[PDB]
Amino acid sequence: ATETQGEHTFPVEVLISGEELRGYTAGEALSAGEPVYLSGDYEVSASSADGGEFLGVNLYDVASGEPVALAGDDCEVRVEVSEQVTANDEILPDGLGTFETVATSAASAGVAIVQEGAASGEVCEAYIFAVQGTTA
């Protein structure tokens, strides 16, 4: 997720507001702003494409086995969406490191709500309100 200013590209600050951040171990290499889920004891990996795999967003780039700062629910975040989104849309991890809408996904409940709409491939602002795990 990046912003252009003249010649320059700047990384966006991922976390807009919130105090709900916690440390985990990377189960694989991760990039800043990716949605992640529990994949072992205190170990987080990149979320797959539908429901049941979301704990928060990764705040900085990591190699496998590194300590991860994660922003959970109760946080407002700048996140890239893979499709066009609008205010009030519930969004969900896309499986591609992006988010997408609940409406587009196979699922029926989101993890964050869009506060500021965006086009496909572009940074929205969203509030993370929930987590999802293995329900069967």
């Binding site: 700047f10 990384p11 966006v12 600050e13 991922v14 976390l15 919130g18 951040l21 290499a29 800043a32 705040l59 900085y60 780039d61 990591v62 190699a63 496998s64 086995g65 590194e66 700062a69």
Partner: protein, 82 residues
């Protein structure tokens, strides 16, 4: 909020500069995967450092097996015609 590892903050970290300076000084080639940890390549953004072995002093220091003439340890970029 920003952390020292967060992508927009890396240019302010003294350690990011110092470790990129190290990486340029210790490399022999642009092939990072061979020479550095995945952790180092990510943490110091080594893909974006101009690493190629051209800044490593050992690229230029002579190290022959037999040294009759005290030639070993001379650095070519310190000679008269450099």
């Amino acid at each position: 909020m920003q952390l020292r590892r967060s992508p927009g903050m890396r240019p302010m970290d003294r350690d990011w500069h110092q470790e990129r300076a190290r990486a340029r000084e210790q490399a022999y080639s642009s092939d990072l995967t061979s020479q550095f940890s995945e952790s180092e390549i990510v943490k110091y953004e080594l893909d974006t450092a101009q690493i190629d072995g051209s800044d490593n002093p050992r690229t230029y220091i002579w190290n022959r097996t037999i040294d009759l003439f005290g030639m070993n340890g001379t650095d070519v970029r310190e000679l008269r015609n450099r």
